[PDB]
Design a binder for these strands. Structure first.
Lengths: 150, 197, 165, 289, 55
RNA sequence: AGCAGAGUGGCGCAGCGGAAGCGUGCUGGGCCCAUAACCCAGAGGUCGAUGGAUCGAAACCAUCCUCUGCUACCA
RNA sequence: GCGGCGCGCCUGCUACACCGGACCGCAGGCGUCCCACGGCGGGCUCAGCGAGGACGGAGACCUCCCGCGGAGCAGAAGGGC
RNA sequence: CGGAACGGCGUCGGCCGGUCCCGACA
RNA sequence: GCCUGCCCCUCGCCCGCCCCCCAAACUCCGAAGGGCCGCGCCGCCCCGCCGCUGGCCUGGGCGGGGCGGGCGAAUGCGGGCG
RNA sequence: GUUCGGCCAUCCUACGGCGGAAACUCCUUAACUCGUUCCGAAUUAGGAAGAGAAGCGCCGUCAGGCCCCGCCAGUACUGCGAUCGGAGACGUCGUGGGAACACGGGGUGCCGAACU
């Protein structure tokens, strides 16, 4: 790589997809961001001012500070032996709030709902676990066989 | 001329067609990829014969020219020129390059010296459509072509009528239904989508 | 329908003098004298040695006259052409154009120092309902049912300017 | 013959522009700038002032733009002005300044709907007279409650000197809603020394009054055709100025919203064809031909 | 006379010997780089009632 | 070969945007009994092909064509 | 040695979908040019296809239509609009 | 019993066909 | 076939519909495989501060109590720091 | 139905039909305010003589485009092992992932604030 400029090998990542070419929905600007929210970083080619680098595209981080115009996000880059927390300042047009732990947040409400149900009444993540028994009707049996090469 | 062609045979370098970047390519030898009755009709020539690659080699354009002439001459003598339509289905786009023998490996990017065509297995390198007169002659005519192409190749009678995708049984069935149509050398299954008049 | 009426939208008189400098200025006055409206010059998009042209050279002068002032000028000009036009002259969109040689025949004094000035009269036609393709809001194009047709225009001119085809 | 520019390809690549922009009603670049709030402000609402003029009615609404929709706090239209005195010229320059008085006083009253001590409306009466005095509602000490800050929307209308939309904003500022502005695009600003009288004249339509005289001198017949409702209703050239001072006054006293009745005259709603109806139609043109 | 130009063989293994060392906890909660309005407010806001460390 | 120059009236050469000139050749009109010199004239060049560019390119720059100008030796 | 300059930089690629990846590997640029080719606001739509208009055609300019950008954005290339 | 494009009536094992009590001019 | 021609037949163009093959520096789409983040202390209910914010009885941060509930992927292992 | 929105073609484009009380537009005029390389064309001011012709709304296209789902196909490709064969090119086998175009069928915007 004789050429390693800031925007290098960003022919495909930075570019918009098929018809998305255009301004950003005003939702990008309207969304309210809280300190410590887990936010993904996804660069948009149109807004050249304030773009996250090609490494930072795809990554998911936390917002260190909410500033006027630019969100500041802290993302971990594994440089050789150590992982380093790099704080960067991204424009609001290239960050997208990330569900991320929406699963955990959904589950804690669900666990609390079950705990609540246990107080109200309730008298009496498993990875797969065995199929158990079961009995299947074999009368619809299609005997299949290999087919000759032709 | 030069290079016994063993050097340029099994597919090795990434495809290098003559775009803006690759220039200076000397003109490919094979130019006539359509021969005989290119102006024929779909119903005629219902027997189709194909030469099919059994290797992943790169058959040279000069080699492709020889195979075209060997097949065209034999069918023409044995049966009428208008009893077959010959299609060289591989086109010689890939460009082969030579490090001139006249320094050495320092600066070895090669000037282009040739044009070659990459043929995967199951690709019909050559195909022919013949009327019953040459239904016999074409099979051995294509063997006399097979030798010029390197590697092992098989002569297989297509069970599809002519060059049409449909099988001979289907082409007659679509024709008898009237669903069939003519596009000069080809037919279409239904043509039933679009605004009704 | 009263709202399906045809009206003339505008008439443009264009004089391409051809790199003569003051002559295009005299023709700026000519268009002003015949229309009581200031002219606008033009600049070259392409520069050509054969045509005596350089990029930005002033070659044309054109005023767009819209209204009774314009309608009168079309008919003064057509009298020069003897109220007769080609059937082909009508454009597909629904506008026509003719050209006159000599500003004098229109009914303008030929002071002879001012040059005889050939002009070209193009007449765009509109209908009530056409402020949909020039408005900043809702600029949606006019529907084909309302749009003028070459055939409609030929008859409207027959039922008005009374010209032979 | 002629190639078809609209290929099945041109159609595939086409990105429809945003719904509102494809209709033409919203300038997205401008409103993106207007809805911008520093992220430090977080979820505090930013209030926009919208003034769009229709063919016969100047429409004003104060709105805040949420993530899922737009939420108008309160709105006033020129249709309401006959209730407060003016039945003709519903789109005139004087109606605009008056609609914005309704727009500003309807809101100042609703913000003060529950305060009951020193309220939003109670703190800021606004200019009792109608005048171009460069009135600014936030130049005062304020503190605790301060003037609601809205931002004027000219929409797709050019910000012309003397524009009707501009009168509406002066009407809102005169009520007391602090809409930031400079008195340069209002009539009578001649570099330094704003002519308050020219704005006072326009907001108390005297310009229409002079035109009424021009027609009453040149040709009475045109003046019946060009001023039919003005002749039909008893709106004299002289009386309109008295009417305007009452119209401004009526608004200040009770500006609350009263709803006219709504009859939903929904249309025929011809139904879409069924697949069998669609297939029979194919059959008819298979039968005829 | 021509030495190898570049290799990354056995670079990832070398890093993994004591690799994936997370960047401390001070960095995670550090006030470095934050808005000089957020922090200036925080320091004054903190100096009230139980949080105040004023003498 | 690499690397560096050169392509223009028929010929030999000039030519920096924007002029394509000279000398001769050539085709006339005289001057001489004629032919030369001589005088009065005219016409001469896709500025080597393919491009590109400023927005008009011998020129500016590549790519080819076509020639020319000089070049490890030594184990 | 000579010829080069991956001897400071950049775009597309080899690079094998995070990032990283070598070569006197490829196809190429830079060392400048702009008080406007700058900032900002307002207004506008471009290249064209077809069609029409004294001179007027392979092109002069004026009009229409339909125009997802086929224009333009100093200069390499990729983006972006 | 390094090796190929190719040949082979060496010897086994398949496949696609047919002719064959009508016996594969009689 | 025609003062000549505009009296026209056949091909090249243009345009449509097919069709043979393709592209490191083409892309409608688009895998494998990888990268980044999460997987425990949640809610309710008040209170204190702030020059930071704002029409406000506003947000938001940083704290103090109470009232609730807990341990809520598999497997293996003590980690961290100079 | 209007104004403002949200996501941004199931919403688009082209061609028919059908409509309006109100609404929207079209429309009518330039005394002014402003406004056009010239032109009230746009635009700005002032209106109400007209109007469904248009825009717009609802329906129609063996309509294109678009979205959905089938089929393509366990195919192409590739992850992981193989003393798997093969002279190689490549291809198999166990253990895992799985396209795409075509082609077939169906559809063809909905969501909130203020209003009336």
């Amino acid at each position: 790589t004789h050429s390693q400029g800031y925007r290098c090998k960003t022919r495909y990542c930075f570019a918009r997809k098929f018809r998305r070419h255009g301004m950003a929905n005003l939702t990008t600007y309207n969304r309210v961001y809280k300190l410590g929210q887990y936010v993904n970083i996804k660069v948009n080619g149109a807004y050249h001012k304030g773009m996250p680098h090609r490494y930072y595209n795809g990554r998911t981080g936390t917002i260190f500070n909410i500033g006027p115009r630019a969100l500041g996000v802290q993302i971990q880059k594994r440089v050789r032996g150590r992982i380093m927390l790099k704080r960067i300042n991204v424009r609001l047009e290239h960050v997208h709030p990330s569900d991320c732990r929406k699963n955990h947040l959904e589950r804690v409400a669900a666990n609390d709902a079950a705990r609540r149900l246990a107080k109200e009444t309730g008298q009496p993540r498993q990875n797969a676990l065995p199929r158990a028994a079961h009995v299947v009707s074999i009368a619809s049996a299609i005997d299949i066989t290999p087919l000759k090469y032709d | 001329g030069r290079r016994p062609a063993r050097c340029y045979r099994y597919q090795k370098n990434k495809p290098y067609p003559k775009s803006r970047f690759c220039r200076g390519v000397p003109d490919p030898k094979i130019r006539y990829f359509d021969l005989g009755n290119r102006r024929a009709k779909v119903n005629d020539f219902p027997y189709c014969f194909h030469l099919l690659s059994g290797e992943k080699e790169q058959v040279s354009s000069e080699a492709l020219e020889a195979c075209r002439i060997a097949c065209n001459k034999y069918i023409a003598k044995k049966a009428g020129k208008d009893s077959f339509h010959l299609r060289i289905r591989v086109h010689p786009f890939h460009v082969i390059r030579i490090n001139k023998m006249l320094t050495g490996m320092r600066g070895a990017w090669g000037k282009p010296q040739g044009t070659v065509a990459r043929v995967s297995i199951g690709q019909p390198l050559l195909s022919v459509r013949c009327r019953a007169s040459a239904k016999d002659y074409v099979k051995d005519a294509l063997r006399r072509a097979k030798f010029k192409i390197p590697g092992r190749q098989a002569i297989v009678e297509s069970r599809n009528w002519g060059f049409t995708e449909f099988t001979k049984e289907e082409y007659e069935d679509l024709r008898e239904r009237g669903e069939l149509q003519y596009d000069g050398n080809n037919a279409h299954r239904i043509s039933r989508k679009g605004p009704l008049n | 329908n009263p709202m399906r009426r045809i009206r003339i939208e505008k008439l443009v008189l264009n004089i391409c003098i051809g790199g003569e400098g003051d002559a295009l200025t005299k023709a700026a006055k000519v268009l002003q004298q015949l229309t009581d409206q200031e002219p606008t010059f033009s600049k070259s998009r392409l520069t050509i040695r054969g045509f005596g042209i350089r990029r930005g050279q002033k070659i044309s002068t054109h005023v767009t006259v819209r209204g009774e002032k314009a309608r009168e000028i079309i008919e003064r000009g057509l009298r020069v052409k003897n109220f007769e036009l080609p059937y082909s002259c009508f454009s597909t969109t629904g506008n026509f154009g003719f050209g006159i040689t000599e500003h004098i025949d229109l009914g303008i004094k030929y002071d002879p120092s001012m040059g005889i000035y050939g002009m070209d009269f193009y007449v765009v036609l509109s209908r009530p309902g056409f402020r949909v393709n020039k408005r900043r809001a809702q600029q949606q194009h006019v529907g084909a049912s309302h749009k003028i047709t070459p055939d409609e225009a030929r008859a409207w001119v027959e039922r008005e300017f009374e010209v032979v085809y | 013959w002629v190639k078809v520019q609209k290929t099945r390809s041109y159609f595939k690549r086409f990105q429809v522009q945003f719904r509102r922009r494809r209709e033409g009603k919203t300038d997205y670049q401008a409103r993106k700038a207007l809805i911008i709030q520093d992220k430090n402000k977080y979820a505090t609402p930013r209030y926009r002032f919208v003034v769009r003029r229709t063919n016969k009615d100047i429409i004003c609404q104060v709105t805040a733009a949420e993530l899922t929709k737009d939420r108008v706090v309160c709105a006033a239209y020129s249709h309401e002005l006959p209730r407060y005195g003016i039945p003709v010229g519903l789109t005139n320059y004087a109606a605009a300044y008056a609609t914005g008085l309704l727009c500003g006083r309807r809101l100042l009253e609703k913000l003060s709907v529950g305060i009951k001590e020193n309220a939003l409306a109670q703190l800021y009466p606004g200019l009792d007279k109608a005048t171009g005095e460069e009135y600014h509602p936030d130049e005062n000490e304020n503190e605790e409650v301060h003037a609601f800050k809205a931002f004027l929307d000219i929409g797709l209308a050019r910000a012309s000197t003397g524009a009707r939309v501009f009168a509406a904003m002066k009407g809102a500022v005169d009520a007391g809603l602090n809409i930031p502005h400079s008195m340069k695009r209002f009539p009578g600003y001649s570099k330094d020394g704003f002519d308050s009288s020219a704005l006072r004249d326009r907001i108390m339509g005297k310009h229409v009054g002079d035109y009424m005289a021009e027609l009453k001198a040149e040709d009475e017949e045109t003046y019946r055709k060009r001023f039919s409702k003005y002749i039909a209703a008893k709106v004299e050239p002289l009386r309109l100025e008295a009417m305007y001072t009452k119209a401004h006054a009526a608004i200040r006293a009770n500006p609350q919203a009263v709803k006219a009745k709504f009859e939903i005259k929904k249309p025929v709603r011809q139904a879409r064809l069924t697949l069998k109806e669609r297939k029979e139609r194919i059959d008819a043109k298979k039968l005829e031909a | 006379a021509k030495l190898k130009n570049h290799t990354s063989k056995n670079q990832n293994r070398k890093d993994h010997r004591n690799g994936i060392k997370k960047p401390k906890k001070s960095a995670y909660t550090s006030h470095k780089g934050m808005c000089p309005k957020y922090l200036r407010n925080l320091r004054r806001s903190r100096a009230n009632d139980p949080r105040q460390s004023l003498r």
